[PDB]
Design a protein around this ligand. Structure first.
Ligand code: NA
Length: 197
């Protein structure tokens, strides 16, 4: 059980610099159930930059800075949209102690969504987006094999960002994760169990 943890939250699109709309509810439940938490909101020019390399670097730096403060610090990594891509890009850079410290990765509307990974669920926890390809999947690696068992990759059916077969680009579905009640429940239960286990 993690006594001290950081929720690293990497936002999307044109969300303002601050907590993403996508995780607000599940985080209230995680922080309420598991003492010792804090939130770091990844600094990067979301919807203003050419890419998210800055977001990836700040995810990696905050994991390393937290472990330096307290080597038993745990992490949950959360990414929405371009922030889910930036989170996926961080995963290969988090090795040994830094890998062991990250207890769970929650992705919503992931542009790097990859077909047939065990972490893939839809908004209702089923398989309607299980084999889906994300809009960035042809050019990126998505969730590496060694991260699948601690990842939850939620793709709402009709979200063209994580499932190119059910929508073209940013579809209204892409915008709905923060007020999807089963998304928030799945995220909260995954994060609580990751930190307590
Ligand atoms: Na769905």
């Amino acid at each position: 059980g993690c006594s001290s943890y950081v929720i690293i939250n990497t936002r999307g699109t044109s969300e303002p610099q601050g907590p993403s709309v996508g995780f607000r509810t599940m985080n209230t439940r995680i922080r309420s159930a598991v003492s010792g938490g804090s939130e770091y909101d990844t600094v990067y020019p979301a919807g203003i930059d050419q890419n998210s390399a800055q977001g990836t670097a700040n995810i990696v730096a905050q994991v390393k800075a937290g472990l330096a403060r307290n080597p038993n610090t745990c992490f949950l990594l959360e990414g929405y949209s371009q922030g889910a891509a930036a989170t996926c890009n961080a995963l290969p850079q988090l090795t040994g102690a830094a890998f062991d410290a990250v207890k769970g990765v929650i992705l919503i509307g992931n542009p790097e969504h990859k077909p047939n990974l065990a972490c893939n669920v839809d908004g209702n926890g089923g398989k309607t987006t299980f084999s889906a390809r994300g809009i960035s999947a042809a050019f990126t690696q998505g969730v590496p094999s060694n991260w699948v068992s601690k990842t939850l990759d939620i793709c709402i059916y009709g979200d063209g960002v994580c499932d190119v077969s059910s929508g073209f680009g940013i579809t209204p579905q892409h915008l709905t994760y923060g007020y999807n009640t089963n998304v928030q429940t799945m995220g909260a239960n995954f994060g609580i169990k990751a930190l307590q286990g």
